[PDB]
Amino acid sequence: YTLAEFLAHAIALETEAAERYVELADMMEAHNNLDTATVFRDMARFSTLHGDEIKQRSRALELPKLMSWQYRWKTPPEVGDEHYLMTPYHALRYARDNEIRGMEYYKEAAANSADPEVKRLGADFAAEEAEHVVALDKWIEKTPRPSIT
């Protein structure tokens, strides 16, 4: 809604993405899925760069403290309580789900906010997140499906 609120969301979304992607990179690497690990390093790096841009913008404003559910990635499928996310197919899909949630926040903000800057950044940020979803879709396509057991 407001630009302060929007920038708080954007920073939180990016801080979260950086952490979650490093974590996924680490897991890919540890099981020698080096290509997928690198997709996630790239994404974690984009988070840092983009987050830094948003942080420069936000120096002008007093930002609200957000609640965790406003920005955290959704918890993944809960089996058997603990792995599933160690396979590339499942990590990529998890990452994609949350890329989409971030995209949707940006699109919703750009549509419903009266502040033209929120409209502008929301649209810009949504378009870029959309390119991430498309890129992850291309990966998921080429990624073989694992079997349980």
Q: What is the binding site for Zn ion (CB under 5 A)? A: 99, 129, 132
Whole-number minimum distance, CB 49 to a copy of itself, in Å? 22
Interacting residue ranges for a copy of itself, rule: CB under 8 A:
19-20, 23, 27, 67-70, 72, 74-76, 78, 81-82, 85, 104-105, 108
Cβ atoms of 94 and 37 closer than 8 Å = no
Q: Which of a copy of itself, Zn ion, none lies near 52, with the C-beta cut-off 5 to 8 A by kind?
A: none
CA–CA gap between residue 35 and residue 149 (Å, rounded): 24
Using Cβ positions, the residue closest to Zn ion within the complex turns out to be 132
Write out the two tokens for 112. 């419903």
Find the shortest distance in angstroms from Cβ 69 to a copy of itself: 6
Query: Is-contact 2 21, C-beta < 8 A?
Result: no
Q: CB-side exposure of 80: number of CA atoms within 13 Å?
A: 2
Q: Which is nearer to a copy of itself, 75 or 149 (CB)?
A: 75
Tokens standing for 127? 């378009």
> What is the DSSP code (8-state) at residue 66?
P
Structure tokens at 53: 């841009």
Q: Which is nearer to a copy of itself, 31 or 53 (CB)?
A: 31
CB neighbours of residue 36 within 10 Å: 22
Question: Least distance to Zn ion from the beta carbon of 74, Å?
Answer: 15
Residue 132 interface partner, choices a copy of itself, Zn ion, none, CB cut-off 5-8 Å depending on type: Zn ion
Q: 99 touches which of a copy of itself, Zn ion, none (CB within 5 to 8 A by kind)?
A: Zn ion
Name residue 10's amino acid: A
CB of 146 to a copy of itself, least distance (A): 18
